[PDB]
A paper describes a structure:
MPER bnAbs show outstanding breadth, neutralizing up to >98% primary isolates, but have uncommon features. Notably, long heavy complementarity-determining region (CDR) H3 loops with aromatic residues at the tip facilitate bnAb binding to the hydrophobic MPER and nearby membrane. DNA sequencing revealed PGZL1 was from subclass IgG1, whereas most MPER bnAbs are IgG3s. Using X-ray crystallography and cryo-EM, we determined the orientation, angle of approach, and composition of the PGZL1-Env interaction.
PGZL1.H4K3 (hereafter H4K3) was chosen for more detailed characterization. Notably, H4K3 neutralized 100% viruses at ≤ 50 μg/ml (n = 130), with an IC50 of 1.43 μg/ml. Crystal structures of H4K3 unliganded and with MPER671-683 bound were determined at 1.45 Å and 1.98 Å resolution, respectively. Strikingly, their variable regions, including CDR loops, are in nearly identical conformations (Cα r.m.s.d. ~ 0.2 Å), which are both similar to the MPER-bound PGZL1 (Cα r.m.s.d. ~ 0.4 Å), suggesting H4K3 is already preconfigured for MPER binding. PO4 and SO4 ions were both bound at the CDRH1 site of the H4K3 structures obtained in lipid-free buffer. Another SO4 ion was observed in unbound H4K3 proximal to FRL3 and interacts with P59, G60, and R61. As this anion-binding site is absent in peptide-free H4K3, despite the crystallization buffer containing SO4, this site may be induced by MPER binding. Similar to all MPER bnAbs, CDRH3 aromatics were crucial for HIV neutralization, but the observed pre-configuration of H4K3 to bind the MPER and lipid heads on the membrane may explain its faster on-rate compared with PGZL1, where reorientation of the CDRH3 is needed.
Author numbering:
A (entry chain H): 1 to 52, 52A, 53 to 82, 82A, 82B, 82C, 83 to 100, 100A, ...
B (entry chain L): 1 to 27, 27A, 28 to 213
């Protein structure tokens, strides 16, 4: 089975360069073309370029010509994407994708196999863990946590260490004018439980190695 | 470059129904080298169709592709719950491959009015010099909703941000969170904080409010 495994998330300041890798396994490597496609948050897919490792032939999208280099290492079955002159407009998930296989080993050209994606964030902001504030409850009551001023994405939230799943909504983060992110997570519960049940939101911000457990009381 | 324009942008159907998605190219696509992809939140795209009408391995027969020249279509003959997602077309008939802007296919359901909740800023946050006021609109349909923040009856504009959840897989509703941000100094000068919500399921706007201090 063909598998594409990409390198981990990247955080870059403007003007800098980024290098992303994609290791292929479970099939022929050099003969098929590997492509890079990116996707800014909430936006469309955009092709950046491709390479056929056997002959090291490349093909780049016109808009990125001069900023993007794609290369391959046959000994390790790995393709690389390098993008220079980064600005905030380059913040996106970057995907590697390989052409499909056809009958008699003829390349498809359409992108059949995909890596898991690599988030590249470009910003002047520095890595920062969130402050977690309660959204205190007033037959059904709502309560939650405000996960404010963290950078970069992502953060995850659970309630009562996974014991509370029903009625939970964790919202997409917003990017504030400060350059820092903020999100909320809420849950609806019986109002009668407010006097007896403990509610704790568990916040994990891996990029800053920050974890917070926040008790939310009425 | 060849520009691909998809239609509709966003539309709603129910499981069991037939979906037809369209992709129009600015120039004829050479050899019908046109592919379709499905993408769900947090996932890489999945190849469904290649070469206009070819179906990828692992793709169910309810997906089919058609078209020629500049007009192409993806048809889902009988929608299943797993089919609600974003769909992209791609032309690869020239060296400069391009994608369409995407079509989001959501689940149609009956109108549901939001349940509205308002949350004052915490005392903890106020110590830091900033006040965040949050308004929650829970479990509504359709997605279109309007939030108006008021501070002592003054309409706030440009000082809030909001986001909306993905459609819930069980009840097909949306929820919305909006945060109004003020300085602590401004927060302490005013009394009535209100979130006014307009939605198709509400015959008149609903306002939730609190008085600072109470």
């Amino acid at each position: 089975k063909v598998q594409l495994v990409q390198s981990g998330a990247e955080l870059k300041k403007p003007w800098s360069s980024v290098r992303v890798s994609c290791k292929a396994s479970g099939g022929s490597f050099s003969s098929y073309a590997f492509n890079w496609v990116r996707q800014a948050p909430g936006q469309r897919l955009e092709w950046l370029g491709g390479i056929v490792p056997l002959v090291s032939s490349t093909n780049y999208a016109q808009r990125f010509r001069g900023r993007v280099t794609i290369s391959a290492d046959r000994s390790t079955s790995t393709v690389y994407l390098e993008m220079t002159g980064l600005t905030s407009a380059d913040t996106a998930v970057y995907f590697c994708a390989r052409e499909g296989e056809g009958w008699f080993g003829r390349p498809l050209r359409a992108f059949e196999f995909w890596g898991q994606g690599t988030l590249v964030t470009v910003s002047t902001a520095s890595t920062k863990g969130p402050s977690v504030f309660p959204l205190a409850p007033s037959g059904t009551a709502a309560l939650g946590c405000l996960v404010k001023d963290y950078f970069p994405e992502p953060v995850t939230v659970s309630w009562n260490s996974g014991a509370l799943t029903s009625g939970v909504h964790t919202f997409p983060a917003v990017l504030q004018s400060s350059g820092l992110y903020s999100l909320s997570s809420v849950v609806t519960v019986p109002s009668s439980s407010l006097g007896t049940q403990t509610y704790i939101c568990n916040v994990n911000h891996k990029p800053s190695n920050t974890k917070v457990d926040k008790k939310v009381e009425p | 470059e060849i520009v691909l324009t998809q239609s509709p942008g966003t539309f709603a159907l129910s499981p069991g129904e037939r979906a037809t998605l369209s992709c129009r190219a600015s120039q004829s696509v050479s050899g019908g080298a046109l592919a379709w992809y499905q993408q769900k939140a947090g996932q890489a795209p999945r190849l469904l169709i290649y070469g206009t009408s070819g179906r990828a391995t692992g793709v169910p027969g309810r997906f089919s592709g058609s078209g020629s020249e500049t007009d192409f279509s993806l048809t889902i003959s009988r929608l299943e719950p797993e089919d609600f997602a974003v769909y992209y077309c791609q032309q690869y008939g020239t060296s400069q491959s391009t994608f369409g802007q995407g079509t989001r296919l959501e689940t149609r359901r009956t109108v549901a009015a939001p349940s509205v909740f308002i949350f004052p800023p915490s005392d903890e946050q106020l110590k830091s010099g900033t006040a965040s006021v949050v308004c929650l609109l829970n479990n509504f349909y359709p997605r279109e909703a309007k939030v108006q923040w008021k501070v002592d009856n003054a309409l706030q504009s440009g000082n809030s941000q909001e986001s909306v959840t993905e459609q819930d897989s069980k009840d097909s509703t949306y929820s919305l969170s909006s945060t109004l941000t003020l300085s602590k100094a401004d927060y302490e000068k005013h009394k009535v904080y209100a979130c006014e919500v307009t939605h198709q399921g509400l015959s008149s706007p609903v306002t939730k409010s609190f008085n600072r201090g109470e």
